[PDB]
Amino acid sequence: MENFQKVEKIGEGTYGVVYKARNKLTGEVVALKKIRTEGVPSTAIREISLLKELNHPNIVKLLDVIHTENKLYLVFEFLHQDLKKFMDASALTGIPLPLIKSYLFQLLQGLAFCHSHRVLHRDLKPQNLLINTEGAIKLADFGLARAFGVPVRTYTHEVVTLWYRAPEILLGCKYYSTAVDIWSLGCIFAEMVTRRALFPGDSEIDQLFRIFRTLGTPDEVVWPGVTSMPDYKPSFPKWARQDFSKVVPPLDEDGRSLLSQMLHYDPNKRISAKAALAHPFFQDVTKPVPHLRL
Numbered sequence: 001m002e003n004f005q006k007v008e009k010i011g012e013g014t015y016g017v018v019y020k021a022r023n024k025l026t027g028e029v030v031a032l033k034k035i036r037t038e039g040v041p042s043t044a045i046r047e048i049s050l051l052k053e054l055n056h057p058n059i060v061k062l063l064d065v066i067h068t069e070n071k072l073y074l075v076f077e078f079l080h081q082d083l084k085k086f087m088d089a090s091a092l093t094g095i096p097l098p099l100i101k102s103y104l105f106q107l108l109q110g111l112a113f114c115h116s117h118r119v120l121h122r123d124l125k126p127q128n129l130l131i132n133t134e135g136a137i138k139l140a141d142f143g144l145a146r147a148f149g150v151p152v153r154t155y156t157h158e159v160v161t162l163w164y165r166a167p168e169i170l171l172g173c174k175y176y177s178t179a180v181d182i183w184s185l186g187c188i189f190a191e192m193v194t195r196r197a198l199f200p201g202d203s204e205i206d207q208l209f210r211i212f213r214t215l216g217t218p219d220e221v222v223w224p225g226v227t228s229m230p231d232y233k234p235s236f237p238k239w240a241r242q243d244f245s246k247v248v249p250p251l252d253e254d255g256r257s258l259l260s261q262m263l264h265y266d267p268n269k270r271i272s273a274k275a276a277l278a279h280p281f282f283q284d285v286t287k288p289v290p291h292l293r294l
């Protein structure tokens, strides 16, 4: 748009490309996300518009929702680096535990906030998490999947990230709950710790089986109703659960304990963001300053 003297394309999200842009007028630097056709649903514009009211220190502010030329643009406050990039840049030394802990605590605060407002993210991933020089981390792009509905293959054909998808989604559950975000966050937490994606599935079944190989194939004991899930197949191989200390070494028992609660198979047993905030793991949480190279 002419209102912006655009800076550049900075990434591609599940629902569209994100641009860094300068509001010529105000000179404001923002993140502009172009939503991907029919002509842009009306129910969606209303629902996404409601997200403009979301105000929380750990939620990237949605400044505007612009509908034009049969195209939807979301204008977001701009943060300089996404967690994926930070993790790649910190892959040699790892993110200090205090920072990982700070980030997780803040992320849980953001989710607790959104969930308490009946807003789910549904597609949480490192690239959706933005950090700034002052130690804050924020979640961006909530409520998009619930407003537009999950795609399948971007217009530009880009490898959709399945790594953070909760098993109930993989098993074809038509109804999502706040639990899917906790699962995604658990996966991200594990990744910050180990510096490697926890469940880097190549496909939907590989994603599911990687989960099964690590957490054990779920059954009716650990997850009542799982054998009735839409995509559940009795033919699924039955893997025994792996010793959990093997999953995120060298994370201490508090962290491993919290993580195990975030990764419970049953969305109903999975810890809530609010409950997670009270976990002993955060007893000594602080807010460290990240070494950010912008």
Ligand SMILES: Nc1nc(Nc2ccccc2)nc(-c2cc(Cl)ccc2O)n1
Pocket (backbone or CB within 6 Å): 010, 011, 012, 013, 017, 018, 031, 033, 060, 076, 077, 078, 079, 080, 081, 082, 127, 128, 130, 140, 141
């Ligand atoms: N620094 C920075 N990088 C990126 N990269 C990125 C974008 C899309 C996919 C993957 C990475 N995205 C943002 C960003 C994104 C949104 Cl939604 C809202 C505000 C933002 O500041 N910011």
